[PDB]
Design a protein around this ligand. Structure first.
Ligand SMILES: CC(C)CCC[C@@H](C)CCC[C@@H](C)CCC[C@@H](C)CCOC[C@@H](CO)OCC[C@H](C)CCC[C@H](C)CCC[C@H](C)CCCC(C)C
Ligand SMILES: CC1=C(/C=C/C(C)=C/C=C/C(C)=C/C=O)C(C)(C)CCC1
Ligand SMILES: CCCCCCCCCCCCCCCCCCCC
Ligand SMILES: CCCCCCCCCCCCCCCCCCCC
Ligand SMILES: CCCCCCCCCCCCCCCCCCCC
Ligand SMILES: CCCCCCCCCCCCCCCCCCCC
Ligand SMILES: CCCCCCCCCCCCCCCCCCCC
Ligand SMILES: CCCCCCCCCCCCCCCCCCCC
Ligand SMILES: CCCCCCCCCCCCCCCCCCCC
Ligand SMILES: CCCCCCCCCCCCCCCCCCCC
Ligand SMILES: CCCCCCCCCCCCCCCCCCCC
Ligand SMILES: CCCCCCCCCCCCCCCCCCCC
Ligand SMILES: CCCCCCCCCCCCCCCCCCCC
Ligand SMILES: CCCCCCCCCCCCCCCCCCCC
Ligand SMILES: CCCCCCCCO[C@@H]1O[C@H](CO)[C@@H](O)[C@H](O)[C@H]1O
Length: 219
């Protein structure tokens, strides 16, 4: 229990550091820019709360012979569409296309959560639904959204592509962790699972945020 608790506290601290840095960076509150900072505060702030809750030993749900971390999935349901929103803003995406990518994202996270909570082998059908919706989300990120980003200045398009790449490459690792970890075949221990996810969560949220902060200043 000590290892898992320690990892969750590290996640909480890293998320808190991001949250404070984004809130501070955003204080200037430029009318067009404010939205991006508030979104980053929401992304890392919600994650921080989730990690604190888990560190305190809340929401460790036993499912068959594994443990499900409910706050992790609730976190993702809330924070991943905020990341997609940030990317859609950057890309200058149209309202229909925003709706599509937010829908596909929500399918991924709901299917992953539901799958984690189903004891039997039918849970892999839920994983599959999420994997299919994720391929759709990736298509949008690398296709239509990238085309949309090209209508922006070269610097904004470069930022879009940088954050798009970070997002696509790291998000693609999560389903493999689900499959190899406790929700799937339970090869990886809960500690190894949590350690990998803490890194990935921190980079996809706080790393993502610092990359945007850097580009915003350099712009
Ligand atoms: C906008 C809405 C339409 C979307 C709402 C999300 C919704 C879709 C989530 C669906 C799942 C929902 C049905 C939950 C059911 C889970 C339940 C079956 C699990 C069993 O319950 C286990 C409990 C305690 O043991 O864990 C319980 C887990 C914890 C109690 C919850 C974990 C906390 C969250 C991860 C953090 C939430 C964010 C903060 C409330 C806001 C922080 C703001 C920030 C800026 C400080
Ligand atoms: C595709 C796929 C998944 C993707 C999860 C992802 C992409 C999580 C990203 C989390 C972030 C960025 C937190 C911040 C699941 C739900 C593991 C299982 C269903 C298949
Ligand atoms: C990571 C710093 C935030 C810690 C907040 C702790 C609040 C928990 C309230 C006590 C209940 C146990
Ligand atoms: C960024 C400032 C917030 C303080 C960090 C909170 C981490 C506290 C870890 C406490 C673990 C001991 C169990 C209680
Ligand atoms: C300006 C730099 C600020 C960076 C934001 C993150 C703050 C550091 C918080 C500690 C992070 C813990 C490291 C966990 C890594 C993933 C699990 C590794 C276990 C081997
Ligand atoms: C950040 C809010 C943390 C509250 C978690 C609830 C603590 C209950 C511990 C049992
Ligand atoms: C600052 C917002 C804190 C939200 C607390 C949610 C914790 C629920 C777990 C009981
Ligand atoms: C021991 C603490 C567990 C309490 C059950 C979860 C409370 C949910 C709070 C919802 C926050 C919005
Ligand atoms: C998924 C989060 C969406 C944030 C709401 C922003 C929409 C404002 C447009 C009016
Ligand atoms: C035991 C439940 C029945 C089998 C579930 C099917 C699992 C499918 C997961 C594969 C991922 C699909 C992605 C489409 C490939 C193109
Ligand atoms: C998108 C590229 C795949 C993500 C990497 C995560 C999976 C790497 C592990 C593959 C080897 C598994 C060996 C099974 C144990 C026998
Ligand atoms: C482009 C592909 C990248 C290579 C990654 C390899 C694929 C990862 C395999 C994940 C699912 C395989 C399930 C078999 C795991 C072994 C079962 C052990 C039981 C505890
Ligand atoms: C354990 C690793 C923690 C990852 C948090 C991400 C902080 C990295 C800072 C990125 C800065 C890029 C500036 C351009
Ligand atoms: C973290 C802030 C990033 C803001 C990107 C700026 C694009 C808005 C154009 C005005
Ligand atoms: C959920 C899985 C979805 C699979 C990804 C295929 C979606 C892309 O499919 C494409 O959509 C375009 C809209 O931008 C259309 O113009 C194209 O005709 C169509 O081929």
């Amino acid at each position: 229990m000590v290892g898992l608790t320690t990892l969750f506290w590290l996640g909480a601290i890293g998320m808190l550091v991001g949250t404070l840095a984004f809130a501070w960076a955003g204080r200037d509150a430029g009318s067009g820019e404010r939205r991006y900072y508030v979104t980053l505060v929401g992304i890392s702030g919600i994650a921080a709360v989730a990690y604190v809750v888990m560190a305190l030993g809340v929401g460790w749900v036993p499912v068959a012979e594994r443990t499900v971390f409910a706050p992790r999935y609730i976190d993702w349901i809330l924070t991943t569409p905020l990341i997609v929103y940030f990317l859609g803003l950057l890309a200058g995406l149209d309202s229909r296309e925003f709706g599509i990518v937010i829908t596909l994202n929500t399918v991924v996270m709901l299917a992953g959560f539901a799958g984690a909570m189903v004891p039997g082998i039918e849970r892999y059908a839920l994983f599959g639904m999420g994997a299919v919706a994720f391929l759709g989300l990736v298509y949008y990120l690398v296709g239509p959204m990238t085309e949309s980003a090209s209508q922006r200045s070269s610097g904004i398009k470069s930022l879009y592509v940088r954050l798009r790449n970070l997002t696509v490459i790291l998000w693609a690792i999560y389903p493999f962790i689900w499959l190899l970890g406790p929700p799937g075949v339970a090869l990886l221990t809960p500690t190894v699972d949590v350690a990998l996810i803490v890194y990935l969560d921190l980079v996809t949220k706080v790393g993502f945020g610092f990359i945007a902060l850097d580009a915003a200043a350099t712009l």
